[PDB]
């Protein structure tokens, strides 16, 4: 009633019963008389630059979290379980924090990706290659994880999950951070004429790199150097072995005239700015990958005004009347693009999924998440594709979407808070 | 400020500050915790049954809609203005009710659509037409109103936006309902051998038709009788003279086989099952239109899998790569269909709006609102095109939602309350 929400599709008059958003903690930004679902960031976590958990805090939340991973693993109450909870009791104490053993770890990992309410693809939660990097004390050791990463993950083409996770956060000691937003990523530049060469979204990233050494190649699709930062000292640029960073040369399975366009996209979508959160520990660095959905190459970074914005030049060579919005030209070319995408990263074999398919699975894993952990948080906003959305089968899904932890949240960009 | 919000366009960087949320005072249904902004009938003040309203309850409401009136015209606190009020409570505690002058029920129309966050098309919520039909008093009345709308909107395919608003609730008189969900649609019948013939969404008010007398032509589009209640009285049917219902075949600029598709819709959409609520009064018969755009019946009528869906035959007949899902055949028929609507339209100068032309309209408003009005709540979940959402620019557009009033809200169905 009260409690027992309820979520029905429209298409297929199913109605689902959520009870796990009660586990909820955290707020959604949403009041009592106003709705902020599409507010981007409500910044009820874009972590500001002050103060961490304090000795106090920090133990609930473990508390939280430790009993969370016994629950699962059928050892609730268990001596095992009270065992760990003193020894993080104590362990906190006297360190003003605590590890998390590698059990704990992947756990919590694996459930930030469950608990991400704008992924589509948490259908594949439980299969996570966890990297744990906590070791790691220099941008050098920092560099050779990624790349590990990166080839794990591209494996040759056959696209695998993966994410690792670098030294939690101290406070006044300083962190890791990969100032790239992903791993890989073209370069934008800003020419003379108030145009922009390459990815506009990138520009001034790039211009920190160029600022820091980095010879551009002033190109349309030049990777980016990876930028990283360790306990807290100045970033060092590194670039990725080409022979690691696989690329798809587009091209459609009609227009000939295509290729002719000279358009390229990357492989691996490796988000790199976000951080991990387990037990009231924060992992400022914990790039984790998957694969993509066509649209948010095709749709999102070559049609979206602000990024590459190719639809013009793909309507003319199409020979379409771009003279009537009426024509819905614009529409035309935005499906020919996001057709040779699909097309030739399953030409060269390269993992990739379609909208289509991509929202089917997501239903099933929701009707999986209801049955077996009752309910699954979904930002409707952000789960509907950029493209044909009606005829997507979560465009009818009704989503509830409650914040849970371990979470993945968004922070600050490490260039308008490292000083020096 | 820290109570100013901003919502911001991710595409202009265009940052708007919101005041007029804090007139609000109704229910979301979202809290700190949770948001339903993808729920359909997010139950939070949809509009009880069983009695209605009390002295206790009106007057306050009454009280905030004139202070509001008054402000508008620029009299708030003059002699009209608290004589008004004296009057309206007055007449309140005696006649346990109040009527609303034809000056104020105009300014309740047009800001209850003005206040519709649902709605993309309202940058033209200042031009209607109001018809006030608070005289009628039988069904035979009903439609000779709703006949004098259909013909003063259609206006030969200049479509007008207008509404016929009738008798206000009571307790025991009772209601005027229409039955119709839209004024004009066409009827749906499952057949015994599991197919559906016509709109498949009318199947239960057609059921209900043809119980109450009406003659089947048991076809495709068969535009369905009215169903009219008076005061509270079982509901009688009624035929919409043919050369009142303005339609149009539906084919294509380049393909000839469209016109063997069988298609056709009419051309004015209007709703006539909501509830307008104003200073207290709730009217459960007012019927408003205005016009198409082309996704309705592009995207959501002739596609959805529910309604006609009708992309398969149109994607043979295109003869598309209909075996795997990545060749996007069915967003490539989606957009030729939607075409057609279009075009099908503007040739029989029937009055109609593209998805690109409307969205960009309503940014304009937007814009325009928050700095007459100082903001406007609008529901990002429907006010993003089914189809091409993000080469739209709401689509990058932050929107708080929020409910004001005088509004329009859902009522249950009449035939399952409607004793007798
Ligand atoms: C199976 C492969 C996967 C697919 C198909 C997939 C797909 C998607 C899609 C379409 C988005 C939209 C991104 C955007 O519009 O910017 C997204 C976002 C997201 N995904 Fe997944 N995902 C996958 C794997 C992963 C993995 C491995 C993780 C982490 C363990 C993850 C965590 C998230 C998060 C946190 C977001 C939020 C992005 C943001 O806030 O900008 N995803 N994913
Ligand atoms: C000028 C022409 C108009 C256009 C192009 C426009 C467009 C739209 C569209 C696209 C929808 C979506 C409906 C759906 O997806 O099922 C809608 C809904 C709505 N519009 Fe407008 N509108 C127009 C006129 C009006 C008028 C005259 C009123 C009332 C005075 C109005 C009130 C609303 C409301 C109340 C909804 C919510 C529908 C619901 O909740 O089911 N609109 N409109
Ligand atoms: C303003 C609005 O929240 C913003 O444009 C959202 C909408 N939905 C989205 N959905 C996905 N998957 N990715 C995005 O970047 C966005 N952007
Ligand atoms: C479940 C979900 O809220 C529902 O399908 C919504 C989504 N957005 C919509 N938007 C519009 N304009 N019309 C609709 O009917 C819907 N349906
Ligand atoms: N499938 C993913 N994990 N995507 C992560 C974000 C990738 C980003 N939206 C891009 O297309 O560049
Ligand atoms: N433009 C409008 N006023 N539309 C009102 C609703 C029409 C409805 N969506 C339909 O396609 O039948
Ligand atoms: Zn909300």
Same mark, same amino acid.
């Given at each position: 009633g009260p409690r027992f929400l309820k979520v029905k599709n429209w298409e297929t008059d199913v109605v689902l019963? @959520? %009870?796990?958003?009660?586990?909820?903690?955290?707020?959604?930004?949403?009041?009592?008389?106003? #709705?902020? !679902?599409? /507010?981007?960031?409500?910044?009820?976590?874009?972590?500001?630059?002050?103060?961490?958990?304090?000795?106090?805090?920090?133990?609930?939340?473990?508390?939280?979290?430790?009993?969370?991973?016994?629950?699962?693993?059928?050892?609730?109450?268990?001596?095992?379980?009270?065992?760990?909870?003193?020894?993080?009791?104590?362990?906190?104490?006297?360190?003003?924090?605590?590890?998390?053993? @590698? %059990?704990?770890?992947?756990?919590?990992?694996?459930?930030?990706?469950?608990?991400?309410?704008? #992924?589509? !693809?948490? /259908?594949?939660?439980?299969?996570?290659?966890?990297?744990?990097?906590?070791?790691?004390?220099?941008?050098?050791?920092?560099?050779?994880?990624?790349?590990?990463?990166?080839?794990?993950?591209?494996?040759?083409?056959?696209?695998?999950?993966?994410?690792?996770?670098?030294?939690?956060?101290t406070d006044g000691k300083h962190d890791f951070r990969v100032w790239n937003s992903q791993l890989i990523r073209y370069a934008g530049y800003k020419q003379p004429d108030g145009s922009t060469l390459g990815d506009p979204a990138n520009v001034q990233?790039?211009?920190?790199?160029?600022?820091?050494?980095?010879?551009?190649?002033?190109?349309?699709?030049?990777?980016?150097?990876?930028?990283?930062?360790?306990?807290?000292?100045?970033?060092?640029?590194?670039?990725?072995?080409?022979?690691?960073?696989?690329?798809?040369?587009?091209?459609?399975?009609?227009?000939?005239?295509?290729?002719?366009?000279?358009?390229?996209?990357?492989?691996?979508?490796?988000?790199?700015?976000?951080?991990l959160e387990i037990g009231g520990l924060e992992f400022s660095a914990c790039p984790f990958s998957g694969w993509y959905m066509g649209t948010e190459i095709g749709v999102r970074d070559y049609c979206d005004n602000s990024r590459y914005n190719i639809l013009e030049e793909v309507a003319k060579k199409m020979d379409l009347d771009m003279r009537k919005t009426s024509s819905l030209w614009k529409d035309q070319a935005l499906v020919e693009i996001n057709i040779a995408v699909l097309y030739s990263f399953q030409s060269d074999k390269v993992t990739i999924v379609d909208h289509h398919s991509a929202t089917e699975s997501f239903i099933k894993h929701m009707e999986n998440e209801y049955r077996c952990r009752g309910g699954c948080p979904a930002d409707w906003v952000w789960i509907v594709p950029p493209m044909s959305g009606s005829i997507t089968p979560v465009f009818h899904q009704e989503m509830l979407n409650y914040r849970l932890t371990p979470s993945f949240e968004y922070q600050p960009d490490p260039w308008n808070t490292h000083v020096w």
């Open positions: 019963t @959520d %009870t796990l958003h009660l586990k909820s903690t955290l707020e959604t930004g949403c009041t009592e008389h106003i #709705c902020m !679902g599409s /507010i981007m960031l409500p910044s009820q976590h874009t972590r500001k630059p002050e103060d961490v958990r304090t000795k106090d805090q920090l133990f609930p939340l473990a508390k939280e979290f430790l009993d969370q991973y016994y629950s699962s693993i059928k050892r609730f109450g268990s001596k095992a379980h009270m065992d760990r909870l003193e020894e993080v009791n104590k362990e906190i104490e006297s360190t003003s924090t605590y590890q998390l053993k @590698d %059990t704990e770890l992947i756990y919590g990992a694996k459930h930030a990706w469950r608990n991400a309410s704008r #992924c589509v !693809g948490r /259908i594949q939660w439980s299969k996570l290659q966890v990297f744990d990097a906590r070791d790691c004390t220099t941008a050098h050791g920092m560099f050779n994880y990624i790349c590990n990463h990166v080839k794990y993950a591209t494996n040759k083409g056959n696209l695998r999950s993966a994410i690792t996770i670098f030294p939690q956060r990233f790039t211009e920190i790199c160029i600022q820091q050494g980095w010879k551009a190649p002033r190109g349309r699709f030049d990777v980016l150097p990876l930028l990283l930062q360790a306990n807290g000292n100045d970033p060092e640029l590194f670039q990725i072995p080409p022979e690691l960073v696989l690329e798809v040369p587009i091209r459609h399975p009609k227009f000939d005239w295509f290729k002719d366009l000279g358009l390229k996209w990357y492989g691996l979508p490796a988000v790199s700015n976000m951080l």
